[PDB]
Structures are given as C-alpha cells and as structure tokens.
Design a protein around this nucleic acid. Structure first.
Ligand SMILES: [Mg+2]
Ligand SMILES: [Mg+2]
Ligand SMILES: [Mg+2]
Ligand SMILES: [Mg+2]
Ligand SMILES: [Mg+2]
Ligand SMILES: [Mg+2]
Ligand SMILES: [Mg+2]
Ligand SMILES: [Mg+2]
Ligand SMILES: [Mg+2]
Ligand SMILES: [Mg+2]
Ligand SMILES: [Mg+2]
Ligand SMILES: [Mg+2]
Ligand SMILES: [Mg+2]
Ligand SMILES: [Mg+2]
Ligand SMILES: [Mg+2]
Ligand SMILES: [Mg+2]
Ligand SMILES: [Mg+2]
Ligand SMILES: [Mg+2]
Ligand SMILES: [Mg+2]
Ligand SMILES: [Mg+2]
Ligand SMILES: [Mg+2]
Ligand SMILES: [Mg+2]
Ligand SMILES: [Mg+2]
Ligand SMILES: [Mg+2]
Ligand SMILES: [Mg+2]
Ligand SMILES: [Mg+2]
Ligand SMILES: [Mg+2]
Ligand SMILES: [Mg+2]
Ligand SMILES: [Mg+2]
Ligand SMILES: [Mg+2]
Ligand SMILES: [Mg+2]
Ligand SMILES: [Mg+2]
Ligand SMILES: [Mg+2]
Ligand SMILES: [Mg+2]
Ligand SMILES: [Mg+2]
Ligand SMILES: [Mg+2]
Ligand SMILES: [Mg+2]
Ligand SMILES: [Mg+2]
Ligand SMILES: [Mg+2]
Ligand SMILES: [Mg+2]
Ligand SMILES: [Mg+2]
Ligand SMILES: [Mg+2]
Ligand SMILES: [Mg+2]
Ligand SMILES: [Mg+2]
Ligand SMILES: [Mg+2]
Ligand SMILES: [Mg+2]
Ligand SMILES: [Mg+2]
Ligand SMILES: [Mg+2]
Ligand SMILES: [Mg+2]
Ligand SMILES: [Mg+2]
Ligand SMILES: [Mg+2]
Ligand SMILES: [Mg+2]
Ligand SMILES: [Mg+2]
Ligand SMILES: [Mg+2]
Ligand SMILES: [Mg+2]
Ligand SMILES: [Mg+2]
Ligand SMILES: [Mg+2]
Ligand SMILES: [Mg+2]
Ligand SMILES: [Mg+2]
Ligand SMILES: [Mg+2]
Ligand SMILES: [Mg+2]
Ligand SMILES: [Mg+2]
Ligand SMILES: [Mg+2]
Ligand SMILES: [Mg+2]
Ligand SMILES: [Mg+2]
Ligand SMILES: [Mg+2]
Ligand SMILES: [Mg+2]
Ligand SMILES: [Mg+2]
Ligand SMILES: [Mg+2]
Ligand SMILES: [Mg+2]
Ligand SMILES: [Mg+2]
Ligand SMILES: [Mg+2]
Ligand SMILES: [Mg+2]
Ligand SMILES: [Mg+2]
Ligand SMILES: [Mg+2]
Ligand SMILES: [Mg+2]
Ligand SMILES: [Mg+2]
Ligand SMILES: [Mg+2]
Ligand SMILES: [Mg+2]
Ligand SMILES: [Mg+2]
Ligand SMILES: [Mg+2]
Ligand SMILES: [Mg+2]
Ligand SMILES: [Mg+2]
Ligand SMILES: [Mg+2]
Ligand SMILES: [Mg+2]
Ligand SMILES: [Mg+2]
Ligand SMILES: [Mg+2]
Ligand SMILES: [Mg+2]
Ligand SMILES: [Mg+2]
Ligand SMILES: [Mg+2]
Ligand SMILES: [Mg+2]
Ligand SMILES: [Mg+2]
Ligand SMILES: [Mg+2]
Ligand SMILES: [Mg+2]
Ligand SMILES: [Mg+2]
Ligand SMILES: [Mg+2]
Ligand SMILES: [Mg+2]
Ligand SMILES: [Mg+2]
Ligand SMILES: [Mg+2]
Ligand SMILES: [Mg+2]
Ligand SMILES: [Mg+2]
Ligand SMILES: [Mg+2]
Ligand SMILES: [Mg+2]
Ligand SMILES: [Mg+2]
Ligand SMILES: [Mg+2]
Ligand SMILES: [Mg+2]
Ligand SMILES: [Mg+2]
Ligand SMILES: [Mg+2]
Ligand SMILES: [Mg+2]
Ligand SMILES: [Mg+2]
Ligand SMILES: [Mg+2]
Ligand SMILES: [Mg+2]
Ligand SMILES: [Mg+2]
Ligand SMILES: [Mg+2]
Ligand SMILES: [Mg+2]
Ligand SMILES: [Mg+2]
Ligand SMILES: [Mg+2]
Lengths: 92, 56, 75, 116, 136
RNA sequence: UGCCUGGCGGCCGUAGCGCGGUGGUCCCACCUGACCCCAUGCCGAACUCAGAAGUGAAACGCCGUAGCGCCGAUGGUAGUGUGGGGUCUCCCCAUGCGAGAGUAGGGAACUGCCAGGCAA
RNA sequence: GCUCAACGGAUAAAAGGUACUCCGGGGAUAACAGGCUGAUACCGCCCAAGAGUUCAUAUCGACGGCGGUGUUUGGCACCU
RNA sequence: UCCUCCUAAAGAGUAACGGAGGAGCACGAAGGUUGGCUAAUCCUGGUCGGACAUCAGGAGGUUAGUGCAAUGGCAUAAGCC
RNA sequence: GUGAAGAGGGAAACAACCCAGACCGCCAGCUAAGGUCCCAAAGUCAUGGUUAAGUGGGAAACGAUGUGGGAAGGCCCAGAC
C-alpha cells in the first residue's frame, strides 16, 4: 500500500484526457490546515490495488517528491462502462 | 513593438465574424504580410482567427 | 388534427438592459407578473410594465427579504 | 404573536413612504410610555427623537401612557423639529390605529407648528 | 408489460438519446447488467429479458429492474400519408445511455449469475456487460 | 468606555428551525380593570381608553449546543465557442470557457443611527 | 345598427352537373413505369422456456434480438 | 379571428393538416379608497351529528385563493373582510 | 456556408462536399486541398511496427486456441500441466 505519484502542472479537460490516454489518471490529496495537492499517478497499479477490500478503509502512504503523505481514499470516479478509474479523492 | 501577421487560408467558407475580423486586421488576400501594433485587442483578433493567420 | 391553434406573440422582455441610459418614460421591462419590481425612479403600470420615471441609467438589483429582483434608476 | 402581525400591518405605509423619499415621523406606542422620532428619508439615521421614557418629559407628567402625555411628547418632538430646520414631514402611525394617543400626538405635533 | 399508470401527456417528442448514463453504480443487489452500448429498450424486451433471468435462477434469488419505459413511441399505420397529425402511441421505451445499470441481482452464486445475465443479454438490442457491487 | 432594553434601518438562511437555558431596578410583556375615546358581523379575545396589586409562566431578548436547514473550495466529470477528424442516430482531437451534483471543511450572522437604565 | 366568425371585411343579394365538352397552362400536382427509402412483405441468422417414451439444438422452435433483398403493401413527388 | 403553454436552440421573433387547453364575456360592487384580517388538510374532545355542516384547542404553513383556460404574479397582500 | 448568380484543382465521372474567388497576356517561380510504381505531373523516399484476409477496395447481432502488443493472476527441483 505505497504508490509513487507525480505533481500535476497542467489541469483541466485537455490535460486530464491527454493524461488518461497515457496509462495514468489524475487524483487529488487534501485535508487539514494545508493546501490541496493535485497528483498525477499510474493507472495499472491503482487498478490492481482497488481489488483488495483494505484499499477503501486502511491508510495509504502516497510518495510525492520524496515525501510520503498518509491518506484514505474518500471518493472515487469510475469510468461509466469500461473497467477503469477516472479520478480519486484522497482525504488526509 | 509591432507584430507581423500573415493570412495563410482563404476567407470563403467562413463565418461573418471571421470575415469581419480579417477586415479589422486589414488582411485582404492569402499571403498578405500585414504588421500591426501589439495590444491586448489585436492579439484577441489574432486569437479569433488563429486557424487562418500566422504570427512572426 | 384535433388542435393546431396558437396566439400571436407578445414581445415581452427586458427592453433596456442594465447600465443603459434611458429617457424619462422609457419602458424598461414588458412582462406579465412582477418578476422584476419597481425600485427608485421606476414605475409599474396596469400591465405590470416597468418604466423609467427619470432620465438616468438602469440598475438591476437583487434585494429584499424574499430576494426579489428590483429595477432602479440612478442619475 | 401580536408584534409580527403589527409589523406587516404597518409595512405597506413604510414601503410606500420610503419610495416617495419623505421624512417620516415614527410613533411607537406602548401600554406604559409613548415614543416618537423623525427619521431621515434614507431611513437609517435619526434627526429628532423624543418619548415619555425621557426624564426631561417624564418628570413633568402625572402618568407616562395617556392622551395628556402623548400631547406632551407630540409637542416636544415638533418643538425640536423646527429648531433643527425640519417642517415638511410625513406621519407613520406604524400599525397603530389612528384614534387615541397617536391622534393626540399627531394633533399636538400639528398644533406645535410641524407642517403635515 | 411495463407501462406508466397514467401520465400528464399522451404523446412525447422524439428527442435525442445523448450523453452518459446516471444509474451507473450497482446499488441494491450484488451483481448487475450494465449497458455498454447506446440505445432504447422497449417494454416487451425488458419483460422478455426478465423472464429469461428469473427462469434461469429459478425461485431463489432477488432481481431488480433499474430501467423503466415512461417514454411513449408513436407509430403511423400502414398505407398512410405524411402529416394529418402525430401518430398513435404503440409501445413504450426506456432510453439507455452507456453506463446504465439495467438489471441487478442478489442471493445467487457468481458462477450461476453470469449465465443468467447472458440469457437476458441475448434478448436485448444493446451490448451489455457484467458488473459487481464494489464497496465505495 | 463598556454592559443591558426599546425605535428605526443596512444585509436577506454562515443570518433560519429545534433543543437546553438563564433576565425583570428601568425597558417589554402579559396583567390589572371597562362611565369616558373607541371596539365586536357574538365576545373589552381583538382594537381602544383609565391604571399599577402581581409575575417573567406564555411571548420576547440574551448565552450554549450541529439534530436539521444553510454556505462550500481544490481536483475530476458533464456540457459547450472556434478550426479539424472519425468507425457519423453518436463521438473524438487542438485551443478557449467550464458546470450541477457530491467532498474536505465552514456554520448558532455581521453591523448603522438614536433613546433609556446601570459599572464608570 | 353586422357570428361582414372564409373574422384586413370582393356584391345589399348566389347552389349544383358535364362521360357531350372546350381553351389556356403544369411534370409547380396525381393515376402507369423509373428513382430515393425499406415501416410492411420476403428471405436468412442470434439466445433456448418447452415438445420429442428419457434427451433444448433429428425436426419444430415461444418470449425477444440482428441482418439481407428490392419480390409485396406503402411513403416521398426527383424524370416524363 | 382572438388568448395561454411547449415546439422556440437562456433577449425579441420563428413554421407544419406539430403537441395540450381556453375566449366571442362577467360585475353599480366583483370599481374606488380607507381600516382590518389569513389560508388548505388533518389531529383530539364535544348534543342530535355520522367521514364531512357548526364549536374549541393543537398541527401545517400557501398544498389555498384569485368571476372563467393556461401562463407569469401577489402576505406591503393583487387574497378574503 | 455553398449553389442559385462562380469558373479553376481534388473527391473516377459528380450545381450544393474539400481546396480556392477568373481584369488581360507570358513556353517563369512558391504553395492549398489532394497527391507522388504504370494509365498521368511528382518518393518503387527514410525509419519502427501491424496485416496474410487481396483486408485495404460496402454491413449487424453473435460466433472462433487467427494474430500482435501489454497489465495482472494460478505451480515446480518436495519434479505441476
Ligand atoms: Mg480553474
Ligand atoms: Mg475539448
Ligand atoms: Mg481538517
Ligand atoms: Mg506577402
Ligand atoms: Mg502584401
Ligand atoms: Mg406565446
Ligand atoms: Mg408562434
Ligand atoms: Mg450615445
Ligand atoms: Mg397606472
Ligand atoms: Mg404503476
Ligand atoms: Mg435538446
Ligand atoms: Mg439526467
Ligand atoms: Mg443521482
Ligand atoms: Mg385526420
Ligand atoms: Mg413552529
Ligand atoms: Mg422563534
Ligand atoms: Mg428577581
Ligand atoms: Mg387586557
Ligand atoms: Mg414589583
Ligand atoms: Mg413590576
Ligand atoms: Mg419564559
Ligand atoms: Mg438568538
Ligand atoms: Mg464541525
Ligand atoms: Mg452566502
Ligand atoms: Mg448547496
Ligand atoms: Mg445562495
Ligand atoms: Mg467554482
Ligand atoms: Mg483556489
Ligand atoms: Mg472545478
Ligand atoms: Mg461542441
Ligand atoms: Mg466543430
Ligand atoms: Mg485537416
Ligand atoms: Mg465559475
Ligand atoms: Mg460549485
Ligand atoms: Mg454543492
Ligand atoms: Mg443529492
Ligand atoms: Mg456531509
Ligand atoms: Mg479550514
Ligand atoms: Mg469536523
Ligand atoms: Mg444557526
Ligand atoms: Mg440556535
Ligand atoms: Mg448569538
Ligand atoms: Mg463555534
Ligand atoms: Mg455572514
Ligand atoms: Mg446577535
Ligand atoms: Mg357592430
Ligand atoms: Mg375572405
Ligand atoms: Mg363566409
Ligand atoms: Mg383573411
Ligand atoms: Mg390577422
Ligand atoms: Mg376578401
Ligand atoms: Mg373524359
Ligand atoms: Mg371532359
Ligand atoms: Mg364546347
Ligand atoms: Mg387542353
Ligand atoms: Mg407548388
Ligand atoms: Mg401501382
Ligand atoms: Mg411511382
Ligand atoms: Mg439504390
Ligand atoms: Mg433503394
Ligand atoms: Mg431493411
Ligand atoms: Mg435461425
Ligand atoms: Mg438460432
Ligand atoms: Mg435453428
Ligand atoms: Mg445477411
Ligand atoms: Mg424495382
Ligand atoms: Mg416532380
Ligand atoms: Mg418539395
Ligand atoms: Mg432526365
Ligand atoms: Mg393570423
Ligand atoms: Mg421550457
Ligand atoms: Mg422560447
Ligand atoms: Mg425566446
Ligand atoms: Mg436564442
Ligand atoms: Mg416583427
Ligand atoms: Mg418561417
Ligand atoms: Mg405554428
Ligand atoms: Mg374552440
Ligand atoms: Mg351605490
Ligand atoms: Mg366589497
Ligand atoms: Mg373594491
Ligand atoms: Mg375613519
Ligand atoms: Mg387594504
Ligand atoms: Mg395554488
Ligand atoms: Mg398559477
Ligand atoms: Mg367582498
Ligand atoms: Mg433562377
Ligand atoms: Mg464550382
Ligand atoms: Mg469546378
Ligand atoms: Mg477531374
Ligand atoms: Mg466518388
Ligand atoms: Mg453527386
Ligand atoms: Mg470535375
Ligand atoms: Mg481541409
Ligand atoms: Mg477573396
Ligand atoms: Mg470575393
Ligand atoms: Mg482576388
Ligand atoms: Mg491571364
Ligand atoms: Mg520562393
Ligand atoms: Mg515546389
Ligand atoms: Mg493529403
Ligand atoms: Mg492513396
Ligand atoms: Mg487515366
Ligand atoms: Mg487525370
Ligand atoms: Mg510519373
Ligand atoms: Mg527499384
Ligand atoms: Mg525502399
Ligand atoms: Mg514489418
Ligand atoms: Mg478495414
Ligand atoms: Mg465487405
Ligand atoms: Mg466477437
Ligand atoms: Mg472465443
Ligand atoms: Mg497471439
Ligand atoms: Mg492475444
Ligand atoms: Mg506476447
Ligand atoms: Mg507497455
Ligand atoms: Mg508480462
């Protein structure tokens, strides 16, 4: 339950779809007094991660720029019919 | 500082606003290197018809 | 067909929009019921037609307990 | 509740009178005491105000809450109003039926010199 | 055969079946038949696909129908010219966007579920897929 | 300066509901009374007048609490202007705009003039 | 003083027949044939509740679904 | 012929033998204005009296009402007195 | 928007589709759409893969150890298929 994840720079409809069509998908980390952090990450890992029931309950430590952030998956966006994730909301 | 605009497409099957915009830039025919003063407006005019004009 | 009827259209709406300079007596809004209400220097005729009562610029406001749209004029 | 029924009973006068943009003389009546205040056409700031709660007027009278007291306030308000420079005003009865104390106040306000 | 018990208006416009579906997640049951394709399911098709499910799984189990028609389709009779009024309402349809869960099932095995949804999926015009209720 | 009332606004739910309170020296309320003013399509209930034995019950004001309502990012999604494209009932791509719903969270309004009482 | 309601009101005042017909025009508009389309018709296929002494798929195939053809009934009025 | 809604693509306008309804009036009070008022529908108790007539309190708060369709509008009430 | 009222190049031929608006001449050059082995002007161009069906060069439900990529999930030296 540890995943490496890049920081987002471009964000919108154009960037997100370009990203999604590149084996990755956008997510976001937020919570506490700190500012939110938009987080690009790989699809094929997190797709295999969600099969386990612990994923939507236990604490995940997401690795960003060296720093490991402790979070829980609050909300999630499935792709309408294809078995694949669009977006995840990581509450801190 | 001025900017050199060039028309790179025909203004035939275009919208009346795009027919106007080229008349506002002063572009008449394809391959017309017209130079204008760089302002927030002219860049907007270029942005309106970016598909058919090229900037230098 | 059983139906195939309709009335002639009434041309109702905001004739003078917010910020526009209007002369004393100019119709600002033709409408049915008081959707917009009469504010400062604006009247309201038998037809609920809001009209300017003074030469000035039209101002749309959203005030009151029930949060209604009011039309005022300021010189 | 009574108050709320009196507020809405008054509102038509207030909302009509603020539209015209006139200086209103509000008169709040009470079983014990009567109040009166001349309010600017904007509605926020007060120019003149008097009541039977004021000791200056209360010290003189027998009982604070009757026709003879209402006249003493109605005189007092209109006496100040003319010194400030006010003369042409309106009378907002404030959801109180124009008959007794408020009438005695109004008639005293007329007889004092205030023009309405 | 499913149909609205009384409506406001008899005949409705054609419209345009566009966008993605809303009833996407498997809410009630454990399994579900999700619509991959775009289309419109008639009142007959739903009953026919329900009968194919209910008979496969026998008396046991529990089935939901997330889709309902509430859209009347008109049809003009044979040997009739154009115009002279909107046609008469013949059948009722539910418009199905991609992602829409059609049927949901509970109280059966995963092995025997898929086979029951194949038999229904065969009856329907729209291309479908199996979906399981994931916890959040 | 402050703490308590009333009057009239500004602002209209972060401001409203419920629940739990607590306040009477003035202020407010009920309360007292019914020749007089006035009132009831019956009724001093209401409206009205003349009062000061009572209480803070109700109503009102103030403090406390998220059970609701209410406000609400960031990110994504839908939609869509313009030029393209496709397998063209429907989509997609470049670029511009960008929701609604939900989520973290916020959240028992904030003030204006004026009057009165009390600690000064 | 007017359902001048054919409601910008031709007159105060007006219905029919023609296969005995005629003139001016129209493929601006039908009947035949062609065309475009394929609801219908025809012809295939997809799933399998059942029949068949037992046994879905020898032979049928309900409920539904997807195509082809231009052969029927049609629609449209693009040619004449 | 006239009115209302949608079709009508967030100003106006916009067709079809497209989709649904109305009008050819009513009123010296149903106008004026002044001064008041607040509804539906339930709950429980009460003579005849019962689901429902009239009464009392409590609940909800505009589901009401608007001389007539439909629309927009109204507690400052355009509502009912 | 185009034709109507617009020729010219392309889409085999093809008023409305893509490119583009003919004042006249020249046996000049650069480009648009679209193209470049031969009919017929120009790449038998360069590199990396896919395709074996003549797909390209008409079509659906559904059917299939076709064939490429991937990302995972079931077992070994106690020797699984
Ligand atoms: Mg942004
Ligand atoms: Mg885009
Ligand atoms: Mg926090
Ligand atoms: Mg040039
Ligand atoms: Mg030039
Ligand atoms: Mg209309
Ligand atoms: Mg119309
Ligand atoms: Mg000017
Ligand atoms: Mg008038
Ligand atoms: Mg029913
Ligand atoms: Mg639409
Ligand atoms: Mg929807
Ligand atoms: Mg929903
Ligand atoms: Mg007919
Ligand atoms: Mg309450
Ligand atoms: Mg309260
Ligand atoms: Mg005490
Ligand atoms: Mg009393
Ligand atoms: Mg005492
Ligand atoms: Mg006392
Ligand atoms: Mg109390
Ligand atoms: Mg409070
Ligand atoms: Mg909190
Ligand atoms: Mg706010
Ligand atoms: Mg909200
Ligand atoms: Mg808001
Ligand atoms: Mg926002
Ligand atoms: Mg921000
Ligand atoms: Mg956003
Ligand atoms: Mg678009
Ligand atoms: Mg486009
Ligand atoms: Mg292109
Ligand atoms: Mg915004
Ligand atoms: Mg928002
Ligand atoms: Mg929200
Ligand atoms: Mg919701
Ligand atoms: Mg929440
Ligand atoms: Mg915070
Ligand atoms: Mg919290
Ligand atoms: Mg609160
Ligand atoms: Mg509270
Ligand atoms: Mg507070
Ligand atoms: Mg707090
Ligand atoms: Mg606030
Ligand atoms: Mg406060
Ligand atoms: Mg006449
Ligand atoms: Mg006529
Ligand atoms: Mg006639
Ligand atoms: Mg006519
Ligand atoms: Mg006409
Ligand atoms: Mg005529
Ligand atoms: Mg003949
Ligand atoms: Mg003849
Ligand atoms: Mg003859
Ligand atoms: Mg002839
Ligand atoms: Mg014609
Ligand atoms: Mg024939
Ligand atoms: Mg024919
Ligand atoms: Mg053909
Ligand atoms: Mg054909
Ligand atoms: Mg066919
Ligand atoms: Mg077959
Ligand atoms: Mg078969
Ligand atoms: Mg067979
Ligand atoms: Mg075939
Ligand atoms: Mg033929
Ligand atoms: Mg023809
Ligand atoms: Mg035609
Ligand atoms: Mg010909
Ligand atoms: Mg007409
Ligand atoms: Mg609408
Ligand atoms: Mg419209
Ligand atoms: Mg419109
Ligand atoms: Mg529009
Ligand atoms: Mg016009
Ligand atoms: Mg038209
Ligand atoms: Mg029409
Ligand atoms: Mg009629
Ligand atoms: Mg009379
Ligand atoms: Mg009356
Ligand atoms: Mg009247
Ligand atoms: Mg009187
Ligand atoms: Mg009144
Ligand atoms: Mg109503
Ligand atoms: Mg209504
Ligand atoms: Mg009446
Ligand atoms: Mg012509
Ligand atoms: Mg041409
Ligand atoms: Mg040509
Ligand atoms: Mg050619
Ligand atoms: Mg061709
Ligand atoms: Mg052609
Ligand atoms: Mg050609
Ligand atoms: Mg092109
Ligand atoms: Mg040109
Ligand atoms: Mg030209
Ligand atoms: Mg030219
Ligand atoms: Mg030449
Ligand atoms: Mg050159
Ligand atoms: Mg060259
Ligand atoms: Mg090309
Ligand atoms: Mg080629
Ligand atoms: Mg050749
Ligand atoms: Mg050639
Ligand atoms: Mg060659
Ligand atoms: Mg060679
Ligand atoms: Mg080579
Ligand atoms: Mg190769
Ligand atoms: Mg192919
Ligand atoms: Mg083929
Ligand atoms: Mg297949
Ligand atoms: Mg297979
Ligand atoms: Mg292979
Ligand atoms: Mg393979
Ligand atoms: Mg491989
Ligand atoms: Mg790879
Ligand atoms: Mg591998």
């Amino acid at each position: 339950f540890t995943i490496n994840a890049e920081v987002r720079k471009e964000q919108g409809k154009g960037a997100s779809r370009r990203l999604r069509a590149a084996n990755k998908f956008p997510a976001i980390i937020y919570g506490g007094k700190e500012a939110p952090l938009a987080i690009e990450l790989d699809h094929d890992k997190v797709m295999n991660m969600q099969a386990k029931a612990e994923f939507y309950s236990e604490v995940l430590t997401i690795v960003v720029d060296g720093k490991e952030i402790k979070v829980k998956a609050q909300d999630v966006q499935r792709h309408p019919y294809k078995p694949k994730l669009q977006h995840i909301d990581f509450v801190r | 500082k001025t900017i050199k605009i060039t028309q790179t497409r025909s203004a035939i099957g275009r919208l009346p606003k795009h027919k106007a915009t080229l008349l506002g830039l002063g572009l008449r025919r394809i391959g017309h290197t017209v130079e204008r003063e760089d302002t927030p407006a002219i860049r907007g005019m270029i942005n309106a018809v970016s598909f058919m004009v090229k900037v230098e | 067909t059983r139906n195939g009827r309709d009335s002639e259209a009434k041309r109702l709406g905001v004739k003078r929009f917010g910020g526009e300079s209007v002369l004393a007596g100019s119709i600002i809004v033709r409408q049915r019921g008081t959707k917009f209400h009469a504010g400062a220097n604006v009247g309201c005729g038998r037809d609920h037609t809001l009209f300017a009562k003074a030469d000035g610029k039209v101002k749309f406001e959203v005030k009151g307990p029930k949060n209604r749209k009011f039309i005022s004029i300021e010189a | 509740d009574k108050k709320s029924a009196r507020i809405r009973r008054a509102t038509r006068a207030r909302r009509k009178l603020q539209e015209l943009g006139a200086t209103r003389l509000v008169v709040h009546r009470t079983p014990r005491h009567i109040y009166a205040q001349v309010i600017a056409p904007n509605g926020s700031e007060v120019l003149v105000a008097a009541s039977t709660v004021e000791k200056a007027i209360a010290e003189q009278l027998k009982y604070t809450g009757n026709k003879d007291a209402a006249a003493a306030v109605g005189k007092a308000v209109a006496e100040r109003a003319l010194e400030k420079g006010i003369k042409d005003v309106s009378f907002d009865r404030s959801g109180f039926q124009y008959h007794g104390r408020v009438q005695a106040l109004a008639d005293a306000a007329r007889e004092a010199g205030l023009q309405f | 055969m499913l149909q609205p018990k009384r409506t406001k208006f008899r005949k409705m416009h054609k419209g345009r079946n566009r966008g993605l579906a809303q009833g996407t997640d498997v809410s009630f049951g454990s399994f579900g038949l999700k619509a991959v394709g775009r289309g419109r399911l008639t009142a007959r098709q739903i009953e026919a696909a329900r009968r194919a499910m209910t008979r496969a799984v026998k008396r046991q189990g529990k089935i939901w129908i997330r889709v309902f028609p509430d859209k009347p389709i008109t049809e003009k009779p044979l040997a009739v010219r154009m115009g002279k009024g909107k046609g008469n309402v013949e059948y009722w349809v539910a418009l199905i966007q991609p992602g829409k869960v059609l049927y949901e099932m509970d109280g059966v095995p995963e092995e025997l579920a898929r086979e029951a949804f194949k038999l229904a999926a065969a009856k329907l015009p729209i291309k479908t897929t199996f979906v399981t209720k994931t916890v959040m």
